Symmetry: C9
Subunit: 132 residues, 9 copies
């Protein structure tokens, strides 16, 4: 139940400090690390089937973070305002980006879904070789 | 997989007036999804006999799924946008639905391409014409 | 166990005259039940000590608007008729949502072929292309 | 041999009623289900190889139907012109379409071959984001 | 000889076909030869430190070129059959059999789907919307 | 294997002047190909011991391979098409080569896309611009 | 000595501590090397399952961690602005160029060896697909 | 060490004879076949892990040949000036082409990279079916 | 620590002969061969896990080469143009190209990554077959 997870800062927290905001974000990173998604795998030994869960990496997201610390995207975007907090926001979003990038690069996360999410572009060069 | 029968405790044609009640209803849908995986039949053999076992697959959350479950029309759901308390709940619920599918596809628990299309994740490209003449 | 789907008809019989949303929903639900009770079957082989054994394994049957209408024995023209009366069009919208959702969740779980289903549902690939040709 | 299979209605059949034509079509459908194609697979045990035929779904086709009931495509097409048979042709062609769609959707027939045969379209949206 | 380029019907060298039955009979000989002559994929197995090898049969795709080659008529002569209707119906029938053999084989993944799709001329259909603002 | 050393019984730089002589040489190539598969090394283990064994793989026939084998240049072979007495043999040999590769690719014994390009099998598509107006 | 150390990447920092002020190429390059070593010493981990006699065993398998310029700056604890500022002195600019080249090569070599996802890395490095198209419409 | 391999004609040889030039090319072909690349493959049993190198086909290349016979690509191109040597160059490049084509067709070499190297083209026909 | 590897030619060498430069390039080639990358492979026996490192081919790059011999890319391009060094640069780059091509062809290196790096192009022929 990922939608139930909330930081220790409680309901509708007010952040008037970088240290406090960053710590709440770190609680989210910690929760993601501690709460992988589960893939049910089936095994069998001599006529008996045993179904055991296998951990899969959970991709970090900004909506996941904000839901966790119990604020709206709009409030999160409000933090961008004060430089004090804006620095924390930048760092948290970079962590989210790098988690997904490193996960995808290590084939722990689906590469194309992450490439699309991160906005990694395909670059190409096309030559028209039609004789004139 | 009798999903078309599933309904929240709020029953038929509920009139939501409270954001906590609407959110609780949405949470009932999320709980239902988690408790009701789709099933893949898998077969194994041993000493001359074949054994079949259903294996749990993640069920993708959808807005139409949610609304059917809490028994409102998509039109009713859009009405909630018209007042701030309910609209905040709609946004929260839609973000949960998006993230469930994104994280599921990212972990290859859901088919990545179909989820990418559903979520509107775009392919971005840069193309140079090297024969501009 | 036989895939004679061309023989499957609802209990409502030939050419139902639905005058009721409860009635029409009821008919739609009979179709959904048949689909789930009637998976496709795939033969899988297993070896053991010099002998191979075959076992059929259930595969999800995709719902379709065509299937539903054929099953309840109304024409597509009749199905679109229901739209005329906002009474039945509400039941039609609900059925089509169920059919869409069945195939979407099936495909998402890889129980149905994702590309077949993406084309069927009309899920689009979206792209953004920048021309970076110098100038 | 699939080119040898024929309905109980004999050579160059004439169809006097929709029930007769439908009966012949259903014979084709039933023949298809009773005659899967076979993938040959090998298994090994203690030095010997076993060749195990494994059943693969046979896709229905209109030309297969017409070969089976022993009429040309041209003749089949004339049945649309009979007021007593037209609805049967429609029904038969719809069964053929549905069998392939359901089979492909269930991963029992090759998805791309069926998608092309059925005319299932890919839809896309493209935005030119070149700065002006 | 029994290699594919050597295989021939029981009508022999350069048969001049002037009947539907004789022609259809010849075509069936080809269809039967194709079924009797799958291609072979070698597979290896290990047992107690000795490797063992045996092949599995792979479906041979039917082709119009293969058929004409087998019944020993040129493609030119085959086209000629199109002109007279006696033969024309047999030609159409045979070509439908060839098409369906490959189509069903590919649908069952017993033949390579993309090779067959290109051969049969099965088309990809698409719809594209330019959503560039303006 | 030294495939570049394989040569028909017609010797060095033969000067073909008969269609039966050219066809016989082409047939020696066809047989050589069918008789000389490529070989892939595969590993096998048993209770902690490993053994390797070559497994036979289909060799694709090619016009360049044919000409190398009968020992004429590719350009000489192209010349044969203009020759009244040799042209039919060229056409026939090129058909055998095409047919072998087609059957191999269709049977998944040769790489499908490499063969599709080699044979010139085309992809056909139909595209509708559905941009509203 | 062959299991997850559990070092959280967002916590990782060089021995130079908080907000270091790099005033020599040597100090800077040493810090960059700490990052390169950290990446090597802290792979990502994939959980894999095994079984023997009806018991399910979990075990982590190491997966290569891709180096990134953002990763480096976070590790040595300077902002992107500061990193870009290093370009002002020919002194530090050489270190920056070399560090970025190391990062590029680590990813390329990882991807080429199938240790990192090829397409993810190709997009990251800006490796282009080049094509030549002939219009053969009878004209 | 492939960059150290050299023909028996020594350093920067001068080829005057077509037979000498062909003989050198054949030394290269022989060297390629005697020097496959190796893939390490791991096997395990009862707690022990064993590694085994497996031979992989080495793709012939014109640059590889010229490095081996120790001439520059420029020198190689210069051979075209003499009808004599030009025939040997064509024969050699033809052997190189076929080795890679046949290896790729048999999936002993990566087919798409070989397709690009050989310049095998994708041919398509595209119909604009937009209604008017 | 590949970022610490350096040729016997020391820091920021100023090369004055083709033999010296070629010698330095060969040290790099030798280093690459002696320094494969490692994939951890896991096996299980009796509820215990065995980890085994497996060698993976390291791709040669001009960037790796210049880092190893400790010169800038512009220095390297300067060698391209130097009458006395240009031949050696061509030779070194040809070695690097062929190592990656052969590795990719053998599937020992990722084919698409290498294809992009080598600049191998996809060639196509397109007919527009629209009616009118």
């Amino acid at each position: 139940r990922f939608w139930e997870a909330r930081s220790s800062h409680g309901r509708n927290p007010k952040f008037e400090s970088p240290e406090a905001l960053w710590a709440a974000c770190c609680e989210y990173f910690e929760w993601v690390e501690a709460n992988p998604l589960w893939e049910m795998k089936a095994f069998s030994y001599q006529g008996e089937v045993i179904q055991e869960p296998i951990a899969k990496m959970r991709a970090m997201t900004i909506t996941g973070l904000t839901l966790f610390i119990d604020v709206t995207l709009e409030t999160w975007r409000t933090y961008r305002l004060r430089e004090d907090l804006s620095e924390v926001v930048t760092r948290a979003e970079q962590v989210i980006y790098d988690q997904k990038f490193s996960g995808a690069a290590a084939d722990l996360l689906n590469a194309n879904i992450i490439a699309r999410d991160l906005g990694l572009k395909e670059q190409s060069q096309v030559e028209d070789v039609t004789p004139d």
